[PDB]
Design a protein around this motif. Structure first.
Motif, short mmCIF file in Angstrom:
data_model
loop_
_atom_site.label_atom_id
_atom_site.label_comp_id
_atom_site.label_asym_id
_atom_site.label_seq_id
_atom_site.Cartn_x
_atom_site.Cartn_y
_atom_site.Cartn_z
N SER C 201 4.91 -7.78 -3.04
CA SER C 201 4.00 -7.95 -1.92
C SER C 201 3.28 -6.63 -1.72
CB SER C 201 4.75 -8.37 -0.66
OG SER C 201 5.69 -7.37 -0.29
N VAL C 202 1.94 -6.68 -1.68
CA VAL C 202 1.11 -5.48 -1.70
C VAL C 202 0.07 -5.54 -0.59
CG1 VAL C 202 -0.38 -6.52 -3.43
CG2 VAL C 202 -0.44 -4.06 -3.08
N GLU C 203 0.02 -4.45 0.19
CA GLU C 203 -0.85 -4.34 1.35
C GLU C 203 -1.59 -3.02 1.25
OE1 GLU C 203 0.91 -4.85 5.11
OE2 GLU C 203 1.27 -7.00 4.86
N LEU C 266 3.97 -1.34 -0.60
CA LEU C 266 4.54 -2.27 -1.56
C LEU C 266 5.91 -2.69 -1.10
CD1 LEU C 266 3.78 -1.29 -5.24
CD2 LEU C 266 2.45 -2.68 -3.65
N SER C 267 6.34 -3.86 -1.56
CA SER C 267 7.74 -4.24 -1.38
C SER C 267 8.06 -5.39 -2.33
CB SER C 267 8.04 -4.62 0.06
OG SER C 267 9.36 -5.09 0.19
N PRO C 273 6.45 -5.05 3.33
CA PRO C 273 5.83 -3.94 2.61
C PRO C 273 6.16 -2.60 3.25
CG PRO C 273 4.28 -5.73 2.83
CD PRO C 273 5.47 -6.10 3.66
N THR C 274 6.18 -1.55 2.43
CA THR C 274 6.61 -0.24 2.88
C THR C 274 6.06 0.81 1.94
OG1 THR C 274 8.51 1.14 3.49
CG2 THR C 274 8.75 -0.31 1.57
N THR C 275 6.61 2.02 2.04
CA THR C 275 6.10 3.14 1.27
C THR C 275 6.45 2.99 -0.21
OG1 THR C 275 6.63 4.44 3.24
CG2 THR C 275 5.93 5.64 1.28
N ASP C 291 -1.71 -14.93 -2.44
CA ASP C 291 -1.43 -14.83 -1.02
C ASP C 291 -0.91 -13.45 -0.63
OD1 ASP C 291 -2.05 -17.56 -0.90
OD2 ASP C 291 0.04 -18.13 -1.22
N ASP C 292 -0.02 -12.88 -1.43
CA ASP C 292 0.66 -11.65 -1.05
C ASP C 292 -0.29 -10.46 -0.94
OD1 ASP C 292 3.22 -12.79 -0.85
OD2 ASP C 292 3.47 -12.68 -3.03
#
Lengths: 238, 106, 299, 99, 100
Positions: C201-203, C266-267, C273-275, C291-292
């Protein structure tokens, strides 16, 4: 095959023979037809110069590049090397951050060249690229044995070259002669073309001289030297 | 396998059902090199054009057309010629892939 | 003879050169009093035959380029590749097959036969070849003098029969999947890598930097779709590639130079998601979903 | 005066760390060509890191230092007014690899 | 064709071209050529376009080739166009219909 084409005047006269009787002695009409057909014949003669310009033993320039593109060994490759650059060192010497070229250097490149701004050392001397292709046609077939590797090294370096040792995953080779600067600089590209099985590390003799020891085909006191395999760094900076 | 008859004409064309495909073959003789050449069309589309007829090799191998092997044979390996191809001194053959497999296994 | 096949390629005689030496041939015949203007009976003939000579030159160039993989196309490209017994895939483009024939850099020319034959195997979506040729184990865990193969898809039997015949005896293989093979009764176990997909999952947070106030940034959905395509393409992240800010800042800025990437997160799904960095082991791979992926523009 | 400090990030089956001179000449040619930074375009980390990472995908930029000749390189931003424009020389670009 | 009395002999070409786009059920052209803002809110030296229907892409490309550079546009909807790369942003009025 054999001679593909013939002299244009042979073809044109062969056709002029088909003229009618009433025109057999019309020098203006016949010479006009000859003028018009002799150029088609001459233009097409230029094609039989497309036959041995691709002979691997003799090809040069773009004809050698095309053969390299067929065999899958391009003229130039990424390296960890400061390629010499064409330019002036402010006369005697300038500090700068490059090294310079002087009208005879295989490392010919300007700072604005695309296969220089991304570290592609490009092989310009045909006599060395031809040798690299003649070696690459061994990687092609996967002829990794010594009988083939020695034959590849003879073409790359000369009749004094030899393959020395077969340790666990590590094979040593020697040109058997002092190398010049051009060959030294191209050395990393030679180990990308030699037939050495993947997963086995190619090495090189230090003095590039024939190796010594005992046996039949070797070198003694005069000419031989003690072995010392070293990493040519063919794929890495480290 | 089958033998494909060749007429005594410097340019001829015929059609045959190979592997249940309608394959149209066009042979034409090149006098300048004294050699026969073939174009092959699968179902109306020219897939091979201007190939030299040579003895002892599969002429369709490079293309992966899926219609078997098409090869020339002669008793002593002579090359095909204007005279010697129509006379039957050089014979054109079609072999199906299963036949080739069976011979290779045998 | 500067024209024709030359060390620089095929040099083509200009039409003007053809016409000029036709006119020289005609002056030498009829005398200096002849008329050859472009609208006279002799001028028209000179033009016609000059055009025909130049078209012969065109044929010569075509014949020369029919032997250059960079210009050859179609079944003639296939015959050219038949020198190395490469084969085109299904629906493969001339450009891709051409790049395969030429071995554009690749920084390590050997293992190109194995890499391309692997790609040719039916069903192989993604393939990659690694080697540890030193006497020490590398940081990725590959033992010395070893060949590693990563492959998605294709049947194990064809894959292994290919890898066995491309890797010599006396050279090991690092992998997680084992395939038993047999030739003439001799029995090699071929180890390959079938990377395990980790749903990432990528933000991403981005700032807008219009080129010389040239044209403004695209939409969030468009940028996310572009990134999904980029990460699902053949240049997708390989096995053992940890997710870092650098990777995504190299992808976003290349796809859209007017956009500055500020903060990547990323997570491992469904985790939040996080560092970065997100550490993938050498047997693991990052797998993405449309979607992610999320992109937000920040002031 | 421009100075880039980078970390090499070579993917396993790829070319090695590209040479410092090649990296310098690549940045020089691209900054000097038609796509040169225009007038009133502040020298900043964004522009130089973008250019470097687009030229060499196997390189990570650690830091950018910028200034005017002979002034000592300074941390960005390097402010340029709408009439001022940045100029460059091949021998005035320095690239080095950080471990 | 005749430009029956319009009180603005120029801008009739732009008005006609706008009405000639497919789907444009209503259209109108406004201008503030004075150095002060009009009571209607159009800044000085500004050309405004009001339109209902028609695709944004075609409408904006059409307005671009009639309105010269250096002339502003006042509106509630912004469309981004591009010719030769020189992307511009064209503002028009998509009226909000208030039931009465």
């Amino acid at each position: 095959m054999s001679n593909l084409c013939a002299d244009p005047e042979a073809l044109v006269e062969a056709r002029i023979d088909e003229v009618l009787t009433q025109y057999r002695e019309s020098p203006y009409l016949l010479n006009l037809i000859r003028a018009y057909l002799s150029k088609l014949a001459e233009t097409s003669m230029s094609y039989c110069d497309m036959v041995e310009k691709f002979d691997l033993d003799t090809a040069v320039g773009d004809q050698l590049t095309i053969i390299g593109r067929i065999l899958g060994f391009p003229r130039c490759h990424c390296v960890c090397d400061t390629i010499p650059v064409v330019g002036y060192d402010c006369g005697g010497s300038y500090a700068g951050s490059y090294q310079l070229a002087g009208y005879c250097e295989p490392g010919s490149s300007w700072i604005h060249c695309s296969p220089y701004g991304n570290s592609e050392l490009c092989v310009d001397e045909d006599e060395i690229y031809r040798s690299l292709l003649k070696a690459r046609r061994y990687q092609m077939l996967g002829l990794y044995d010594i009988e083939s590797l020695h034959e590849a090294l003879q073409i790359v370096w000369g009749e004094d070259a030899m393959v020395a040792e077969t340790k666990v995953g590590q094979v040593v080779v020697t040109p058997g002669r002092s190398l010049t600067a051009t060959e030294t600089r191209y050395l990393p590209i030679v180990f990308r073309a030699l037939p050495i099985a993947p997963g086995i590390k190619g090495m090189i003799h230090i003095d590039q001289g024939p190796i010594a020891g005992y046996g039949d085909g070797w070198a003694g006191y005069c000419g031989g030297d003690w072995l010392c395999p070293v990493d040519p760094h063919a794929y890495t900076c480290s | 396998m089958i033998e494909l008859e060749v007429l005594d004409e410097s340019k001829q064309k015929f059609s045959v059902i190979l592997n249940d495909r309608r394959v149209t073959i066009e042979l034409w003789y090149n006098t300048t090199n004294d050699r026969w050449s073939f174009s092959l069309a699968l179902d109306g589309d020219n897939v091979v054009t201007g190939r030299r007829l040579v003895t002892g090799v599969d002429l369709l191998a490079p293309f992966g057309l899926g219609i078997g092997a098409l090869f020339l044979l002669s008793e002593n390996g002579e090359p095909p010629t204007r005279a010697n191809l129509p006379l039957g001194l050089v014979k054109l053959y079609h072999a199906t892939q299963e036949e080739i497999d069976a011979a290779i296994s045998a | 003879m500067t024209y024709g096949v030359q060390p620089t390629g095929y040099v083509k005689k200009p039409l003007a050169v053809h016409l000029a030496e036709i006119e020289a041939s005609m002056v030498d015949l009829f005398g200096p009093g002849v008329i050859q203007t472009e609208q006279s009976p002799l001028g028209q003939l000179n033009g016609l035959y000059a055009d025909l000579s130049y078209d012969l030159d065109e044929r010569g160039e075509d014949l020369y380029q029919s032997f250059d993989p960079e210009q050859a196309e179609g079944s003639r490209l296939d015959i050219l590749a038949r020198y190395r017994l490469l084969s085109r895939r299904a629906g493969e483009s001339d450009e891709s097959f051409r790049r395969a024939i030429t071995n554009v850099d690749r920084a390590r020319i050997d293992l190109s036969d194995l890499s391309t034959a692997l790609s040719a195997i039916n069903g192989v979506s993604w393939s990659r070849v690694y080697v540890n040729e030193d006497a020490t184990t590398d940081a990725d865990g590959i033992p010395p003098n070893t060949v590693s193969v990563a492959v998605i898809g294709g049947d194990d039997d064809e894959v292994a029969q290919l890898v066995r015949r491309y890797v010599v005896p006396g050279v090991g293989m690092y992998g997680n999947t084992t395939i038993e093979t047999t030739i003439g009764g001799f029995c090699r176990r071929i180890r390959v890598i079938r990377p395990v997909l980790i749903p990432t999952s990528v933000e991403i947070d981005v700032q807008s930097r219009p080129l010389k106030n040239g044209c403004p940034p695209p939409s969030v959905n468009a940028m996310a779709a572009g990134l999904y395509t980029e990460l699902t393409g053949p240049d997708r992240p390989g096995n053992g590639e940890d997710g870092t800010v650098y990777l995504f800042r190299k992808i976003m800025e290349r796809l859209y130079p007017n956009v500055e990437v500020v903060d990547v997160r990323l997570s491992q799904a469904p985790a939040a998601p996080t560092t970065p960095p997100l550490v993938m082991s050498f047997f693991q791979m990052m797998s993405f979903n449309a979607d992610d992926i999320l992109v937000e523009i920040v002031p």
